[PDB]
Design a protein around this ligand. Structure first.
Ligand SMILES: CC(C)OC(=O)CSC1=C(C(=O)O)N2C(=O)[C@H]([C@@H](C)O)[C@H]2[C@H]1C
Ligand SMILES: N[C@@H](CCC(=O)O)C(=O)O
Length: 351
């Protein structure tokens, strides 16, 4: 008759044990009679034994900077075996928390990237990417691209198909993200792609045309950026919307008392770039809308058309600007992701 055998998922005396996974113990030639795991202060860790008695596993989050002692006994027809193991878990120098957009359960437009923003600079971008699990249904190829040292984006080659489910699991707890920085916790969000809404602003006509699943539903006269402060061409992702907002140029790097500075209260404002471009109500320029460009870059429309835009456009819908005297919106603006060529985006920038 054989003596039972105990096998744990950790080794006695180990250090740097990662807490991204549970601790387990298994028995062979016998069953587990008792397993306890305690903190250095003596507090027991929650765990559960399988019904057949062969496997025990922790069932609660294990802590950073802990010394745990595991005690296990197995019993079989051939006798008994007992082991005691002590190990230390990872000791981070820093913790970073991820924040994910869009919100859980949200319905968003066909331009919405997955966005994961860490509250600290990430030294090992590849480790962060490998810790993020994206599920799509219907499945579609996509790729990660970093906008700065803290925020990574994931998107497909082309705009999302309406009706797609997107699941984002940021599994960074216990993961070394470089230079001793570990994830503060896990985060999990899910969103769904709604109707295709693409609004095109053509400087040749000074009309902003809104198309919903390919059909024109609204044609709004607009006044875009004057020649000295023009609106950049390119693809813009719709962000936040405001019934009213004080637009402060200092938010976008321009002092208010400077030649192109401003501080202006506007109604019905939909943000389309981090650089400060909005679609918004402009009662002062209704005469120029559809005729001449007068703004600092914003898409001026009538009060009723700005309210319509606020009511009918959602986060992740698309505004495309064409034929202006500006350049192209930067790919790393924050809402300019689609201006990066797919070959470049797909290659990534983790290194
Ligand atoms: C994931 C992408 C697609 O969008 C979002 O994270 C939404 S956060 C929000 C927007 C916005 O209109 O989207 N921002 C600004 O302007 C702020 C910039 C200047 O820091 C941020 C903040 C107020
Ligand atoms: N708004 C600018 C300065 C504007 C001003 O000239 O008063 C800033 O504080 O960055």
């Amino acid at each position: 008759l054989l003596v039972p055998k105990l096998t744990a998922s950790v080794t006695d005396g180990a250090v740097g044990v990662t807490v991204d996974a549970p601790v387990s113990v298994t028995a062979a030639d016998g069953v587990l009679a008792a397993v306890t795991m305690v903190n250095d202060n003596g507090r027991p860790v929650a765990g559960r034994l399988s019904p057949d008695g062969l496997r025990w596993s922790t069932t609660e989050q294990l802590g950073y900077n802990r010394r745990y002692t595991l005690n296990a006994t197995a019993l079989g027809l051939g006798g008994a075996a007992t082991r005691q193991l002590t190990f230390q878990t990872s000791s981070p120098a820093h913790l970073t928390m991820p924040y994910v957009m869009p919100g859980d359960g949200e319905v968003v437009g066909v331009g919405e990237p997955v966005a994961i923003r860490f509250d600290e600079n990430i030294a090992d971008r590849g480790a962060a990417e490998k810790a993020i699990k994206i599920t799509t249904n219907p499945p579609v190829e996509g790729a990660f691209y970093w906008l700065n040292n803290r925020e990574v984006r994931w998107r497909p080659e082309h705009f999302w198909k309406p009706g797609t489910a997107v699941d984002v699991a940021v599994n960074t707890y216990g993961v070394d993200l470089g230079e001793g920085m570990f994830g503060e916790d896990n985060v999990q969000t899910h969103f769904t792609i709604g109707d295709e809404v693409i609004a095109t602003a053509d400087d040749n006509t000074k009309i902003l045309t809104v198309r919903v699943n390919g059909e024109v539903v609204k044609s709004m006269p607009t006044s875009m950026g004057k020649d000295s402060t023009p609106t950049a061409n390119g693809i813009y992702i719709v962000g936040s919307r405001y019934k009213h907002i004080i637009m402060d140029s200092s938010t976008y790097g321009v002092p208010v008392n400077s030649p192109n500075g401003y501080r202006t209260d506007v109604d019905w404002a939909t943000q389309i770039s981090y650089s400060g471009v909005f679609v918004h109500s402009a009662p002062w320029s209704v005469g120029a809308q559809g005729h001449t460009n007068t703004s600092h870059g914003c898409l001026n429309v009538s009060p009723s058309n700005a309210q319509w835009f606020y009511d009918h456009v959602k986060r992740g819908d698309i505004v495309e600007v064409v034929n202006t005297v500006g350049g192209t919106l930067p790919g790393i603006d924050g809402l300019g992701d689609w201006n990066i060529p797919w070959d470049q985006w797909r290659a990534g920038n983790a290194k």
